[PDB]
Amino acid sequence: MNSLIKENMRMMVVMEGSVNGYQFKCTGEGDGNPYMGTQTMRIKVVEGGPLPFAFDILATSFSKTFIKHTKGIPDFFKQSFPEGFTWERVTRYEDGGVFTVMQDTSLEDGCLVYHAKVTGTNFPSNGAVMQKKTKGWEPNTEMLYPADGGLRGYSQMALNVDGGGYLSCSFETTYRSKKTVENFKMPGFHFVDHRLERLEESDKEMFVVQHEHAVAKFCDLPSKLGRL
Amino acid sequence: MNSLIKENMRMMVVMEGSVNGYQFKCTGEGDGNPYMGTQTMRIKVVEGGPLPFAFDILATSFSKTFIKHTKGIPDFFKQSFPEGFTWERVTRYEDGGVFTVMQDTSLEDGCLVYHAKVTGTNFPSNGAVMQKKTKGWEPNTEMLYPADGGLRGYSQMALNVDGGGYLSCSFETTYRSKKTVENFKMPGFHFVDHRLERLEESDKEMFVVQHEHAVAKFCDLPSKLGRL
C-alpha cells in the first residue's frame, strides 16, 4: 500500500564474505508477492564454490519487504521506500558456530536490491555444517518490538541434521529505516511467523532455490487482560 | 484423555530459593482446565516478603499439564501420569540477571503437586527487577523437539518495564517424563503459544494471582514442501 511496492516485485542480491576463513561470493535473483508474504529466490555461488560448509547457514541472509501484515500492524519495511532500510544480525549456533551480517536494502528502477556482508567463524570441522549433513530449517516465530530508534527482532531456529535430530541457533536483529521516524508509523510488539524452505539445489549447492512465507501477527491466544 | 487428568484439576506449589542471595519461600494453590489450556494460581510469599525484586522473574516457575494440544501432537505431560515429570530451566536476562530452576511435578490424591527450587543472581541493583519497575510479560511462542531422552524447549520472552520499553530474556528447558519412553508417544517438533498474565496482586506482591493460556500447535503457515 506503499505505491512503490507493487503486488509483484523482483529482487536481486549480492552476498560477499567468509565462513571459517573460506571466502565466497553469491548472487541471486527472485520475485514474490509482498502483500501475500511469499517470495522465491534463485541463488548462485559465483566465487569459492563448491562451498565446504552447509549453505543452510546462509539462508536467512538472502528479504523483509515480503511479509504479509495482519491485524493492526504497520509495515516497517514497506513504509521505508523509497529510502529503504538496513538490517544487522548476529546468529549464535549451539555447537559454537557464529554468523554476523550487515545488509542493505534499496529500490532501484523498480527492483529491490540487496547487499549482504557476512562473516562466519568457529563452525566445528566435525559438525553438520562443515560435513554438509544439514537438511533444512524448521519454521519459526520471530518476536519484535521497537528499540534503539529501530525495530528489534529475536529469533530461535532449528536446523534438521542427518540422522534425525536438530542443531539450534538464536539471533538478534536490528532493523533500521532510512526514512525519518516522523514520516512512518512504527509498529509495537508483535510476531512474524516464518517458513524458510529450500525447493531445489544443484552442483553441490552451487545453485539453490529458496522460498519464504512470512506473516506479521499478534499472538492468537485470548487474554484475561484485554491485551493484544 | 489420561484418565487421571480430569477436565478440571487443582494444583498446589511450593517454591524455595534465592535471588541475588535474598532467600524466600512461596506457596500457591490453583485450578484449571487441562484440555482447554487454561489455569489460574493464587500465590503467597510466606518467607522473606515483601521481596526486594520483581515477582515477574518468578512467574514462569509456578504448570505444564495445562496445555491444550491441537492437530497431531501427543501430550508429553498428560501422558506421564501417574508417574509425573520434571523440568529444569536456565533463563538468561539481557541486563545480566540469571534464574535457574529444578521442578518436580507429581499427582497425589487427585491434585497436582509442584516443587520448584530456584536460584537467581546478578540482577543489577539499578535494574527494573530490583527497582520493581516491571510490568508483566508479553505472550510468547516456545519451540520444542525431543532431545536427550526428554523434550527440549526454547523460549524468548519480553518483560514490559516502566516508561514503555522491554527487558528481554531467553531460556532453554529440559522436560523429562518419569514414565518409561516405551510407554508413551513422544511428540515431534512443534510449538506452544503461551500468554502468562498477572490478574491481581496485593501487599507489595506478597499475594499474586496469575493465569496462563497455552496451546501446542504447528506453524500455521503453508509449506512448499508438504511439511508440518
Curated annotation (Swiss-Prot), chains A, B:
The keyword Hydrolase does not apply. GO terms for biological process: bioluminescence. Keywords: Chromophore, Luminescence, Photoprotein. Pfam families: GFP. The keyword Cytoplasm does not apply. Fluorescent proteins have become a useful and ubiquitous tool for making chimeric proteins, where they function as a fluorescent protein tag. Typically they tolerate N- and C-terminal fusion to a broad variety of proteins. They have been expressed in most known cell types and are used as a noninvasive fluorescent marker in living cells and organisms. They enable a wide range of applications where they have functioned as a cell lineage tracer, reporter of gene expression, or as a measure of protein-protein interactions. Contains a chromophore consisting of modified amino acid residues. The chromophore is formed by autocatalytic backbone condensation between Xaa-N and Gly-(N+2), oxidation of Tyr-(N+1) to didehydrotyrosine, and formation of a double bond to the alpha-amino nitrogen of residue Xaa-N. Maturation of the chromophore requires nothing other than molecular oxygen. Signal peptide: none annotated. The emission does not change over the pH range of 4 to 10. Maturation occurs via a green intermediate and is complete within 12 hours. Recombinant expression at high temperatures induces oligomerization. Pigment protein. Belongs to the GFP family. Monomer. This is Red fluorescent protein eqFP611.
